[PDB]
């Protein structure tokens, strides 16, 4: 009873960073030798485990989060590193364990003139606890009851489009990314093989 790995990586349309998607995968035999196929794999690294030993152990419950980010912020997705991609957008814990995978896909997500389909919260009042996502629509303040629908010196719209174009520098082309996270408290084994 195999697992749907080539069904999440082979996804046709991804979610935006700020409303990232999570999917539980369990009760199946998982093999991490088929992942090498797709993409150039600009980055494939693990914290707390080593990939060469990863094909063997059994886990409690493994989750998969997918979203799209710029190509100069990939570094921001790391245990406990500060920036602007893990402050108000989406944040992982400081004791994270698992693996991360990214591949610059500038051939399916960037149109000519700016692909205005993926946005991110630029203005937030306070940073966010690990693994919470915010979809509440609110206008930033400006030393006064925030403009209720408008934009002045401040009072900007929370979400800003990326505008991917097929001519940017490598660090500005989009990058599809997926994150694996799982406990190893040796809980009732649900997946391995």
């Amino acid at each position, epitope marked *: 009873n195999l697992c749907p790995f080539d069904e999440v990586f082979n996804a046709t349309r991804f979610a935006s960073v700020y409303a990232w998607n999570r999917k539980r995968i369990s009760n199946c035999v998982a093999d991490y030798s088929v992942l090498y196929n797709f993409a150039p794999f600009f980055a494939f690294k693990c914290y707390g485990v080593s990939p060469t030993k990863l094909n063997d152990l059994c886990f409690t419950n493994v989750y998969a989060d997918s979203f799209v980010i710029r190509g100069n912020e990939v570094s921001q997705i790391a245990p406990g590193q500060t920036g602007n991609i893990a402050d108000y957008n989406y944040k992982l814990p400081d004791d994270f364990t698992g693996c991360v995978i990214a591949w610059n896909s500038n051939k399916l997500d960037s149109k000519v*003139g700016g692909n205005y389909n993926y946005r991110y919260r630029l203005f937030r009042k306070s940073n966010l606890k690990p693994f919470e996502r915010d979809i509440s629509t609110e206008i930033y303040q400006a030393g006064n009851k925030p403009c209720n629908g408008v934009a002045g010196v401040n009072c900007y719209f929370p979400l800003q*489009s990326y505008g991917f174009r097929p001519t940017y520098g490598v660090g500005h082309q989009p990058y599809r990314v997926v994150v694996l996270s799982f406990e190893l408290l040796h809980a009732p084994a649900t997946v391995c093989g």
Partner: antibody, heavy 125, light 110 residues
């Protein structure tokens, strides 16, 4: 099952404007990527415009750029396309079609599956 | 930017046909997303095949899509009568315009 009925087209004078309404039945138009296809009389098909699910991505045809506004009534659950400042070369039939892989885990190429009945517009004296 | 699709064909029940649909190196070749729709006079064009090898519901196995480099080619077997209809090869691109169409083919049976 799922129908895409049109309404609002017909005869017009050159220079004026008109509005087409695409009514979806059998499913929810508030989460299905849409796009219009125009077909002149006795020719092939041609792309018109496209709305996304977000509502924040809008792509027009290069010829209808500058005019031909598009929007969606998620309250009345329709799609609206207003053709404004029309010319003589736009007489054609119009279809309102929805992209099939509108899910989140499709791993399947795009295809306009649900088609519209289609209505005609004629621009002359 | 449009696909070039041929004029017309003709054959009797039992023969088999093919139809060529060329393109550039950005819409058909390089993306392999081409699809094919059919239209009888007076009906909204209905999906016939997509993803080339992916035949959708109801379709008679008599259709067989294929893509070679830039060219695409359809091959219909078991020449019947309903074949009397237009056939358009469409594709998704990466510059402006997310879909283009072929000139259109008229398939008539003798």
């Amino acid at each position: 099952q799922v129908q895409l009925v049109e309404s609002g087209g017909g005869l017009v004078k050159p220079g004026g404007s008109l509005r087409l309404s695409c009514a979806a039945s059998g499913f929810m138009i508030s989460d299905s990527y849409m796009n219009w296809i125009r077909q002149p009389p006795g020719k092939g098909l041609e792309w018109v415009s496209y709305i996304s699910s977000n509502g924040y991505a809008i792509y027009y045809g290069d010829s209808v750029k500058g005019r031909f506004t598009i929007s969606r009534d998620n309250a009345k659950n329709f799609l609206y396309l207003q053709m404004n400042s029309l010319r003589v070369e736009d007489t054609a039939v119009y279809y309102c079609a929805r992209e099939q892989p509108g899910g989140y885990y499709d791993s399947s190429g795009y295809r306009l599956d649900p088609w519209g009945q289609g209505i005609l517009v004629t621009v002359s004296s | 930017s449009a696909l070039t699709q041929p004029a017309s064909v003709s054959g009797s029940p039992g023969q088999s046909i093919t139809i060529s649909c060329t393109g550039t190196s950005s819409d058909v070749g390089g993306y392999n997303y081409v699809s094919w729709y059919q239209q009888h006079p007076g009906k909204a064009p209905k999906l016939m095949i997509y993803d080339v090898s992916n035949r959708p519901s109801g379709v008679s196995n008599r259709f067989s899509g294929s893509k070679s480099g830039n060219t695409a080619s359809l091959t219909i077997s078991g020449l019947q009568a309903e074949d009397e209809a237009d056939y358009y090869c469409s594709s998704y691109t990466s510059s402006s315009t997310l879909y283009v169409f072929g000139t259109g083919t008229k398939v008539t049976v003798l």
